[PDB]
Amino acid sequence: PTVEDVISQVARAHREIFVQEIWEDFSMSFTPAVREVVEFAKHIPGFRDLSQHDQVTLLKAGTFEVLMVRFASLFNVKDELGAMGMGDLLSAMFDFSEKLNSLALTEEELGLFTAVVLVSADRSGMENSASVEQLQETLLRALRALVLKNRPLETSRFTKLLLKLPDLRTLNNMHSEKLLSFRV
Amino acid sequence: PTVEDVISQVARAHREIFVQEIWEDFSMSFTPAVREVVEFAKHIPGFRDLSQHDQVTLLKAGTFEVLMVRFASLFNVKDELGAMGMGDLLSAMFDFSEKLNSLALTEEELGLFTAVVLVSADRSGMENSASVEQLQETLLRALRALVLKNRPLETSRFTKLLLKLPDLRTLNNMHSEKLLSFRV
């Protein structure tokens, strides 16, 4: 659809949807967060035209990275929780978010960036990888428009945002294997 | 008994007796180690004349600190295992052992120091705290003799060893609450 519809639709969905006791507490944070990401995805123009398999494959591949972006905003200035093994994670999450906040993304930019991250996940296992890619390009097209309407003289603004993607792949490849804990 | 008997007896006992897969592996290291400490204690002249309650009370109070001393030798030069939450522990254990190794204790000195650590544990709960104290003094008496026969010009050698005790109390007070994990 039109660049304006996509921006509007995504931004709206983003606005609406978003001792060892510490480890248990962190551990159960993820369940509602993952469900928030799943609901957001459903509001992304074209996501629910992908096959069930491809939808599910993208969320599995891309949800951790989206959570890295969401934590980013939910961080701080001050900021510990090292002793649970979430040390190098939440400390990696802090440094990433610092970087992200330097861009000073508006809520529309952040919402649309977040959507770009989800559909920019690794595509190993796609039934129709081409459909996933058309969706990615649609979203990146909108993001580029948005960013250039917003800041015409910063022409590498979109470039900087796109550079967050390798970073997210790295955080993903290093920390998605961190252990959670749930009292049986 | 005589200073020579104590040194001999303790030194001998010391010589004779001494992903998440990493966390499980570390976790089960402690069980034989704790049993080694319990057997050592039984060879300490006068330990088994303390009441069962006092014996048990000392091992509970003092075994973690003894393990800190044992790890000390079983460390290295190079040296990771941060991600399990044993980060600030094994890293505290590294710095303590560095300090300990600078003294360059002989095996007799280390053996007798180790015994001093066990019986120098916090005495909250002692049926006969005076008996525990006479034992402590006996062992410190021997250690002082030993250290001064060995290095007569370093007169603060025994002083430096005694300064490891507050350190051990601190490591104890900070890290004894670290979580272990055992597959049920």
Binding site: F30, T31, V34, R35, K60, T63, F64, L179, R183 | -
Partner: peptide
């Protein structure tokens, strides 16, 4: 007792459970 589960495996479980509801 506790269930120890990787952050990645928890994510797939929740996605799977969410799509089966």
């Amino acid at each position: 007792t506790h269930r120890l589960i990787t952050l990645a495996d928890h994510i797939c479980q929740i996605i799977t459970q969410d799509f089966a509801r």
